[PDB]
């Protein structure tokens, strides 16, 4: 079947499990894909969504060695525009008052999922743990 | 040319960049590979090198979404033999008194390199400099 393009956006600090299993859900959409996976600059996600570990340069270059990647922007922009789709060829956007319904809309938006706990803070925790409080 | 059956074991607990490149530079040996990779079980690694925060399936999970390793040996044994390469085809072993001089003299060694300052602790270490001392 054809080809089609799929785009997944993030911040991929610490990159870790559950950001790798939504990555691999991404490229499986639909049976021939390319990935696209943009990478938020860190000036746009320190603004708007939090503290950021990782440069872009190293989010960036993790992400580069996850087998469903097929191509990286970044950075990228931090509000996905129609035009923005057009410029790079996007078939659809896939991630987890509506700033999205206009994707839903056009029919270009796909779900993906969350694991829980399995992110990099929490096997800190686990590390921890091994040091009774009293 | 020829395809060449590379294997590189470890532990891969908290999988990093450092990891990733060491697989990559693997990978890359020659034009044609298929890298194996070995991920040695929770016991044994307890017992002989020293504490690991990630169980055998996590640790292994996590490996099948890095682009170069082609199979996963899970878990590995913990010293690699002459059976074992001819076991499973193994052209050369990739890693980084000498229980490894019987590689060499066999011809199936390959150095690979090790990232400093890139690991999983090293990111824990860098959050915790926002807070001063004082």
Same mark, same amino acid.
């Given at each position: 079947?054809?080809?089609?393009?799929?785009?997944?956006?993030?911040?991929?600090? %610490? *990159?870790?499990?559950?950001? %790798?299993?939504?990555?691999?859900?991404?490229?499986?959409?639909?049976?021939?894909?390319? *990935?696209? /996976?943009?990478?938020?600059?860190?000036?746009?996600?320190?603004?708007?969504?939090?503290?950021?570990?990782? #440069?872009?340069?190293?989010? #960036?270059? #993790? *992400?580069?060695?996850?087998?469903?990647?097929?191509?990286?922007?970044?950075?990228?922009?931090?509000? /996905?525009?129609?035009?923005?789709?057009?410029?790079?060829? +996007?078939?659809?956007?896939?991630?987890?008052?509506?700033?999205?319904?206009?994707? =839903?809309?056009?029919?270009?938006? =796909?779900?993906?999922?969350?694991?829980?706990?399995?992110?990099?803070?929490?096997?800190?925790?686990? +590390? *921890? =743990?091994?040091?009774?409080?009293?």
């Amino acid at each position: 079947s054809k080809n089609v393009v799929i785009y997944a956006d993030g911040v991929y600090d %610490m *990159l870790h499990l559950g950001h %790798m299993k939504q990555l691999e859900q991404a490229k499986k959409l639909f049976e021939n894909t390319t *990935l696209i /996976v943009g990478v938020t600059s860190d000036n746009e996600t320190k603004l708007f969504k939090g503290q950021v570990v990782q #440069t872009l340069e190293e989010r #960036t270059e #993790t *992400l580069k060695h996850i087998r469903w990647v097929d191509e990286i922007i970044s950075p990228c922009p931090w509000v /996905v525009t129609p035009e923005f789709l057009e410029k790079y060829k +996007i078939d659809y956007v896939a991630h987890d008052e509506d700033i999205y319904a206009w994707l =839903k809309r056009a029919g270009k938006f =796909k779900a993906t999922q969350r694991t829980e706990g399995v992110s990099t803070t929490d096997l800190i925790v686990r +590390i *921890l =743990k091994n040091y009774e409080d009293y």
